[PDB]
């Protein structure tokens, strides 16, 4: 059942990335 | 982790860019070549096993 | 223009892709010159036990 | 003593082997700190003294006896530059080259650069004057090869800069050490005798063209060449192969 | 940091590839372009020798051991674990030292010295690639080149010499022994006598290259004086190794049988081979 | 392409030097001898002169007698024919004694006995040049760098012709005087004792013959690349150290991230080349008094795989 | 204190650009992760 | 991307350039010969 | 900051050119990885 | 031996503690392999003996 | 023991920390390889046994 | 005094971090001994 | 002052504290042995 | 016996300690070594005979 | 006097400290041969 729970925290793991992506953008316009 | 920028008051960019490219790189080919060395994870005979090739 | 600035840009990567494929394929040259000299040698017929327990 | 071991497989080539090990690791901690009597403490950019000397002591002081009077050096010791150094940092981090503020042939720094040695003549085992001009020797005359003296020395410009008017010889070494080179305004200068080619119709000078011949430091007495004007001259001549631009 | 003289030599340019990009210092070590393609084939040739380790099942680092493909292989590929990381790290191998000559190059430019040491360093490397490329490639297998391993690799020696008898029969071996021992001695004699001047009888003043001359001619009747002997010790190093590399690019493509057998050409020649007495009649 | 400072461009000639004196007994020295224009393209051209005295004369007579002991038996397993003595010049071979003689000198003339006093001969010979090398730098006020240095080649050769044979037993151990046979001789004593690769002083031995032609290659190269400043005159750099040394010390600490300085290379050069026969000798004791078999011993000290 | 030169604003500035490559960088692997996983799953 | 661009103010492109030529061409070079290692896609073995 | 001596401008219009290349050198390539997977697929 | 202290007047402390500490480690450690060496003393055997951990 | 820190104007705290480091560093990864190169007391095998994760 | 030219304070001072660094070092490897101990006694 | 220029009473303190050290680490290695001596004796 | 302390007037004392402590060290430990592969002197045999220690 | 240039007073001094320090190593010694002999004797 790792196949589906895998699935699952590579989803989560993005979301993630997402953020910090964003918060990235967040800060770089000079904040 | 709002003070981790001051690490590029530590480090000058120059040097910091090329380390870790060259860093990312050679990680990344030992991980291919650790795979490739494995018969569970070569991917050119997994194929060749699949399709029966000369395996 | 900003043609020019495009043709600059791929000259100076044909500078270095040159460059690399020089040693590249004098290297294999190289090679090719030992393989042909090994051609016209009787190496086929004495050919030596191999030194290695490997094989 | 064959099979002989005085515990599991420690034979008495086993004790040989560990106990080399203990004197390798001792003669190379002293090959190294031996090896630290010149350019040590270790410096900032700056100038001032680094935080981190390494992780081997300076030796203690020895003492050399000069021949000739001319005293003692202690090493390690107090080590100044004593000259100035024509750089600019092009970075506030340490680590990346220091340009040239102005002419670095001239200002004698990077492969220009030279030592403030002792303005003295290097002497003989007797005393005497070790490099002169063969014509100050009478018993020298050029044994074989292409004598140079009377060629026309070009520049890598492939122009003319002067010609070969003596050979300045080491006396005991006996061989041949500079090329005296007078230029068009019969001013002469010393070239390093490395730094030439004797072709069979020319001097060939590949560090220099012809117009910098004139910047080659100059000799205060015709008669003798100290080491402090030898390492200005040596200097000068190998910086152009960096610095000499078409 | 610096060596209290160093500032004054840490200038700009002199680089072959890359100009400024990676004209730069880390700690004392100078970069370069080459300096990066250095450290990559170096960390990348050391880790999958490691991995090479994990593959044979040891951690003893004298008995890790990297054999090349079986003679089965020819020149062509082999599996990873089955000589395919040897050929690999024959690459990184051949890639690291070559980037470290090159980046010799670059230094000896920033400097303005000769270019001595990474011309003679490039002897090595061709007596490197005789071994592990030339010659296997000339006899037709990877098989024939040694393997990286610290013990392993003197079995090759030993199985590869004594396939033609004793190894000390080969003419061009025994031209390299004469300089690697002659190279030896030279170095032994040049340090202690350096050392002898700059060091002398306590109280005594730093001696001459006058008395350096005078103790030997006055020991052999000959001195070949400062310059000479800088000349001898790089040549000896060159020679032995250049005919290190002969004497293995003829065993086995032009030689094969015993190399004992070879010296029978002179005990043969047709004006004594008959004569009786001696140890050959 | 520029000049690389290999062979020399002008030679000069000036008087003949005597080179110095110190408290060197000039009756004892020499005329100099003549110059070869052939040996000034690469280094001096002066011949002599040489010193002789009372350590010369006795290591130059017995040497000769060593010499002339090992020619006459060649000249006797020739048959005195002169074309079988230059055939079979590399094959003739005057061999210890047999090992049933032991130590004894009771073998006879052609079953060893000539291989004594030609041995004999040798001891004398060589021990008197070290003398020789010790009492030059003497009279010279120098240091004994170059009669310590050379004590370390003499305890290999002591090790393989005298030290070894003693405690061995045996006068056969000991290594015949000959051309092929002293080969035969090196392959035999490593196949007797179990390959000599596994022998880890024959290891190290051999790691400082490799690190003596690294060191000369390094240093030969280095002084040649820096002489464009006068580095060759390496005692005038370490009394008053000019651009050469700091250009020197430079390349290797930008290279390989640590320097010697000019005299302390010499150190490194010295020591380098010392520890070949310190660590052989050591190595040849060992095998057989110690190790009868080298492979066997890397067995079971993990240097080799178990069977 | 700074070793290299930059300035506070000048460090924040050139540290949130290259934390845009760092997870940038690190989705796109998460990705490759992910396709290998449903490929050919190790755990 | 936002400011991506801001590489060139760092690294000098004339250099970044030409050494990117040589690691691409020496990357494709890897791959090829990692295919031509492999016995399934030794295309050179006729 | 500012080692490269380009103005901000400069650089913008650079990286456009670039990028506009490593978008086409990529594009070729799938069409390369594209064309290799129907004739030989790997996966 | 009231007047051992003297010693610190022929011999500089620094090269005396550093050359001692050096002596003590090496020792000790010379001790503890021997014991490991030793089959009645390899405490890391004896236990796996007592508490039966092996076969 | 009321004077030890008096080892500071001896020893310099720049080499004595870095020797320091090296020095635990080295030793603990000692007493760890000399436990993974015993049978009885390899954590791993232990594990491997008594999950039965080779049986 | 002294051969670093610290002086006794600041001897004193270097000390006292130094001996919070081996105390705290010391408690943890005790409690690693312990635990390894109830966990399998070597004695 | 000898050969390393120490004062007398430099010597007299750094004696004592070195000697201080000495008893304390050779009081605890008697502790070892003693201990070790009644677990397992050699004699 | 009452007048050898002039000794320390021709030896510098501390060649001579340096020399003494290292000569005696060497004896030692050659003298151990001697007893441990003398098979009726090596103290852990005879103790794991007398206490039955190694069945 | 002497070569070494440490004086008569000096010298007589430092024996004194080299042979109690000498008598009392050989005194440990005569008691370590003592009991090994009595344990073991080698004759
Ligand atoms: C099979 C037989 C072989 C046998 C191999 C051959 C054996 C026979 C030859 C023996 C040669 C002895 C070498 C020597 O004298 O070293 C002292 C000297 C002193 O230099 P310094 O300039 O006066 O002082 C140091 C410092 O001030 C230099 O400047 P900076 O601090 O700004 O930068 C540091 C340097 C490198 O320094 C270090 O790496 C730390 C010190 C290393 C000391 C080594 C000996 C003592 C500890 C040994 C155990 C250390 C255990 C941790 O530059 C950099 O760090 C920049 C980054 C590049 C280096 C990355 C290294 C990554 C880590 C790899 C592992 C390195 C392990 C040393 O140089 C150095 O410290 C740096 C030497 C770097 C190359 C050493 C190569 C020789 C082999 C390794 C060291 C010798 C022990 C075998
Ligand atoms: C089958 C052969 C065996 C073997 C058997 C041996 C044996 C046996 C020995 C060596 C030894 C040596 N081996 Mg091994 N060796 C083999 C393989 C190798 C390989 C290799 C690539 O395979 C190498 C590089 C070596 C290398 C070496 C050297 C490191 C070492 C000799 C050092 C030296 O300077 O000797 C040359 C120097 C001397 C002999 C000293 C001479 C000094 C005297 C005083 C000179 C007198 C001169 C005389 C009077 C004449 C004067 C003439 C003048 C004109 C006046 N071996 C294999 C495994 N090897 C030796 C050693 O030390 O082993 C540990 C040794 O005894
Ligand atoms: C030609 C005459 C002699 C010579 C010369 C010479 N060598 C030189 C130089 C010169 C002039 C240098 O400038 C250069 C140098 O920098 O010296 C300090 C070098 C050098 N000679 C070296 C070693 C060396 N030289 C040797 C020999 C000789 N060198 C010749 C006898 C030998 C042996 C066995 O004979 C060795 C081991 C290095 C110290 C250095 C080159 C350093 C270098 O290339 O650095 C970059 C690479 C690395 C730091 C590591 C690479 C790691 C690999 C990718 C993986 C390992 C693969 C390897 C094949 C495994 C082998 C296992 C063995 C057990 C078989
Ligand atoms: C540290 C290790 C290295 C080493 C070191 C070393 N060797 C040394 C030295 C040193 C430091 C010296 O100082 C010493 C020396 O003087 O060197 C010039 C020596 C030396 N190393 C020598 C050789 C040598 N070294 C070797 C090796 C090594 N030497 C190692 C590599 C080797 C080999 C096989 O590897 C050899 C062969 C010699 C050149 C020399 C020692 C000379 C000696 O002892 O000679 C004894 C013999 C004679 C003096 C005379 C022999 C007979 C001659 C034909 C003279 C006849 C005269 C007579 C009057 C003629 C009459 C004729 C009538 C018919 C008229
Ligand atoms: C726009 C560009 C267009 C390019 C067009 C395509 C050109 C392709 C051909 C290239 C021509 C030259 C190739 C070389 C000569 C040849 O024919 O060889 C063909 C042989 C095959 O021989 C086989 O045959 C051999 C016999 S024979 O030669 O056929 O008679 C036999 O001996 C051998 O066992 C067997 O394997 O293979 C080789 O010689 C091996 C080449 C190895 C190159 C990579 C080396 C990797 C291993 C480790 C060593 C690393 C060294 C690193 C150095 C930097
Ligand atoms: C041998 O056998 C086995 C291998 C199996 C087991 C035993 C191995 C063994 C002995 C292991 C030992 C491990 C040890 C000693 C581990 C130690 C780990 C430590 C101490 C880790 C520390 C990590 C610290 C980090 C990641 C810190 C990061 C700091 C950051 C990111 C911020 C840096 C600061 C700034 C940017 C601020 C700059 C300030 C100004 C004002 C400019
Ligand atoms: C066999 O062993 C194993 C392989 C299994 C071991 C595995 C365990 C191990 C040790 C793994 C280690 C992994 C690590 C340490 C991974 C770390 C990865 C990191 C740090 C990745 C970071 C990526 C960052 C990126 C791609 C950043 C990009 C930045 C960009 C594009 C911006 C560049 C800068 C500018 C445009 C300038 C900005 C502004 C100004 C004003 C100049
Ligand atoms: C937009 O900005 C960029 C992203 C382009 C740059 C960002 C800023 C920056 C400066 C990044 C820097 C990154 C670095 C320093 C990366 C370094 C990567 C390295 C060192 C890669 C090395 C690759 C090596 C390869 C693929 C080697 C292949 C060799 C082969 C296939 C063997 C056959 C080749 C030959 C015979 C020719 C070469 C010669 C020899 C002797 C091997
Ligand atoms: C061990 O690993 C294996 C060998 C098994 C696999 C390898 C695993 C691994 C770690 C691979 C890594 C690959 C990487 C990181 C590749 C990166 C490639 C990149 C960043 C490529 C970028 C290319 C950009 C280009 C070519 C841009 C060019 C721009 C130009 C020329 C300017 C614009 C001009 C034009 C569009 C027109 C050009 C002119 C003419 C005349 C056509
Ligand atoms: C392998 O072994 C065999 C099987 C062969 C058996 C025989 C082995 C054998 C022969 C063993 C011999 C052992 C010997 C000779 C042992 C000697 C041990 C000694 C002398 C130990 C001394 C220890 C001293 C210590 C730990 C002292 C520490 C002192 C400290 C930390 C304080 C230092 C002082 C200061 C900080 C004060 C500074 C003052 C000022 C004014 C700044
Ligand atoms: C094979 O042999 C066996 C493994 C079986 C047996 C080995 C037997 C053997 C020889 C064992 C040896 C054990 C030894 C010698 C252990 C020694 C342990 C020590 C000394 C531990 C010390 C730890 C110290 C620590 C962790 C210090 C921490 C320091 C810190 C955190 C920093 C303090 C400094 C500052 C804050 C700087 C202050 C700055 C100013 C300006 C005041
Ligand atoms: C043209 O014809 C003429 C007759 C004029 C000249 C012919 C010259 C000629 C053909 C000479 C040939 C010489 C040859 C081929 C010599 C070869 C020598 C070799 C390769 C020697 C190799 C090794 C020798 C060693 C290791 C010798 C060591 C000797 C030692 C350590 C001396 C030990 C001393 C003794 C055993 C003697 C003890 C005796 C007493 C009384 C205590
Ligand atoms: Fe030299």
């Not at chain 4, 107090?78 to 970075?91: K, M, Q, V």
């Not at chain 5, 001047?197 to 004086?225: C, Q, W």
């Not at chain 6, 090992?99 to 006879?108: C, K, R, W």
């Not at chain 6, 000798?281 to 890397?298: A, E, K, M, R």
């Amino acid at each position: 059942m790792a196949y589906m729970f895998g699935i699952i925290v590579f989803l989560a793991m993005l979301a993630v990335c997402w953020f910090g992506f964003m918060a990235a953008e967040r800060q770089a316009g000079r904040l | 982790m709002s003070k981790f920028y001051k690490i590029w008051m530590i480090f000058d960019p120059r040097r910091v860019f090329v380390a870790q490219g060259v860093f990312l790189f050679l990680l990344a080919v030992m991980i291919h070549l650790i795979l490739l060395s494995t018969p569970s994870y070569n991917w050119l005979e997994i194929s060749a096993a699949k399709y029966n090739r000369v395996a | 223009p900003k043609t020019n600035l495009r043709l600059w840009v791929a000259f100076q990567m044909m500078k270095g892709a040159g460059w690399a494929g020089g040693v590249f394929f004098g290297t294999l040259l190289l090679i090719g010159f030992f393989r042909v000299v090994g051609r016209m040698l009787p190496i086929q017929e004495n050919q030596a036990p191999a030194p290695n327990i490997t094989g | 003593m064959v099979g002989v071991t005085a515990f599991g497989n420690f034979d008495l080539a086993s004790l040989a082997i560990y106990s080399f090990w203990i004197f390798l690791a001792g003669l190379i901690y002293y090959l190294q700190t031996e090896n630290m009597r010149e350019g040590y403490p270790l410096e900032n950019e700056d100038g001032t003294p680094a935080a981190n000397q390494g992780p081997f002591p300076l030796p203690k002081p020895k003492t050399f006896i000069l021949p000739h009077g001319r005293g003692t050096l202690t090493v390690p010791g107090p080590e100044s530059e004593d000259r100035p150094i024509a750089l600019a940092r092009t970075a506030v981090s340490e680590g990346f080259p220091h340009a040239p503020t102005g002419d670095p042939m001239k200002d004698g720094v990077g492969p220009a650069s030279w030592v403030a040695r002792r303005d003295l003549p290097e002497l003989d085992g007797h005393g005497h004057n070790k490099i002169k001009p063969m014509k100050a020797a009478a018993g020298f005359h050029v044994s074989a090869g292409k004598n140079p003296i009377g060629l026309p020395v070009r520049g890598c410009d492939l122009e003319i800069a002067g010609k070969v008017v003596d050979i300045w010889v080491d006396i005991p070494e006996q061989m041949a050490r500079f090329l005296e080179v007078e230029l068009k305004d019969g001013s002469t200068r010393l070239l390093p005798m490395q730094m030439v080619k004797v072709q069979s119709n020319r001097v060939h000078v590949n560090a220099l063209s012809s117009d910098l011949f004139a910047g080659i430091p100059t000799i205060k007495s015709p008669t003798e060449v100290t080491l402090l004007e030898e390492d200005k001259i040596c200097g000068y001549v190998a910086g152009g192969l960096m610095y000499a631009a078409p | 940091a610096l060596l209290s003289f160093e500032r004054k030599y840490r200038v700009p340019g002199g680089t072959l590839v890359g100009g400024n990009l990676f004209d730069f210092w880390v700690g004392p070590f100078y970069v370069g372009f080459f300096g990066v393609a250095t450290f990559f084939f170096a960390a990348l040739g050391i880790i999958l020798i490691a991995w090479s380790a994990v593959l044979q099942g040891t951690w003893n680092p004298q008995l890790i051991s990297v054999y090349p493909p079986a003679l089965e292989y020819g020149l062509g590929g082999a599996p990873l674990a089955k000589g395919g990381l040897w050929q690999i790290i024959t690459i990184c191998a051949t890639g690291a030292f070559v980037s470290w000559a090159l980046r010799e190059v670059e230094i000896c430019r920033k400097l303005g010295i000769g270019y001595h040491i990474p011309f003679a360093f490039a002897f090595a490397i061709l007596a490197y690639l005789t071994l592990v490329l030339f010659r296997p490639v000339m006899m037709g297998a990877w098989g024939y080149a040694f393997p990286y391993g610290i013990w392993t690799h003197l079995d090759w020696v030993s199985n590869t010499g004594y396939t033609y008898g004793n190894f000390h029969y080969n003419p061009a071996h025994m031209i390299a022994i004469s300089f690697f021992f002659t190279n030896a001695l030279a170095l032994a004699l040049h340090g202690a006598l350096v050392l002898s001047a700059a060091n002398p009888e306590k109280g005594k003043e730093m001696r001459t290259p006058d008395h350096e001359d005078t103790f030997f001619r006055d020991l052999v009747g000959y001195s070949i004086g400062t310059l000479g002997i800088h000349r001898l010790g790089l040549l000896l190093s060159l020679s032995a190794v250049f005919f290190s590399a002969l004497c293995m690019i003829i065993t086995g493509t032009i030689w094969f049988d015993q190399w004992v057998d070879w010296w029978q050409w002179w005990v043969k020649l047709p004006w004594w081979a008959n004569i009786p007495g001696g140890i050959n009649g | 392409a520029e000049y690389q400072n290999i062979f020399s461009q002008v030679q000069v000639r000036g008087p003949a030097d005597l080179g110095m004196t110190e408290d060197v007994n000039l009756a004892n020295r020499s005329g100099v001898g003549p110059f070869s224009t052939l040996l000034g393209w690469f280094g001096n051209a002066q011949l002599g002169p040489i010193y002789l005295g009372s350590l010369g004369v006795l290591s130059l007579f017995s040497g000769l007698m060593w010499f002339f002991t090992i020619g006459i038996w060649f000249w006797y397993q020739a048959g005195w024919n002169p074309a079988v003595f230059l055939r079979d010049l590399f094959f003739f071979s005057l061999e210890p004694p047999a090992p049933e003689y032991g130590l004894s000198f009771a073998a006879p003339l052609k079953e060893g006995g000539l291989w004594l006093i030609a041995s004999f001969f040798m001891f004398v010979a060589v021990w008197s040049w070290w003398g020789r090398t010790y009492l030059r730098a003497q009279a010279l006020g120098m240091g004994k760098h170059t009669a310590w240095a050379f004590l370390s080649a003499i305890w290999l050769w002591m090790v393989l012709g005298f030290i070894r044979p003693i405690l061995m037993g045996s006068w056969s151990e000991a290594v015949p005087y000959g051309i092929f046979s002293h080969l035969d001789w090196t392959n035999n004593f490593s196949l007797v004792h179990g390959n000599l690769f596994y022998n880890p002083f024959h290891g190290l031995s051999i790691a400082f013959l490799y690190g003596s032609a690294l060191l000369f290659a390094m240093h030969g190269a280095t002084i040649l690349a820096v002489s464009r400043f006068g580095g060759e005159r390496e005692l005038e750099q370490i009394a008053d150290r000019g651009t050469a040394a700091e250009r020197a010390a430079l390349f290797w600490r930008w290279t390989m991230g640590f320097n010697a300085t000019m005299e302390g290379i010499h150190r490194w050069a010295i020591w380098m080349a010392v520890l070949v026969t310190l660590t052989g000798g050591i190595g040849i004791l060992l095998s057989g008094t110690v190790v009868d078999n080298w492979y066997v011993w890397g067995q079971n000290h993990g240097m080799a795989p178990l069977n | 204190l700074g070793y290299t030169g930059l300035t506070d604003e000048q460090a924040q500035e050139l540290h949130s650009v290259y934390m845009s490559g760092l997870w940038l960088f690190s989705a796109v692997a998460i990705v490759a992760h992910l396709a290998v996983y449903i490929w050919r799953p190790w755990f």
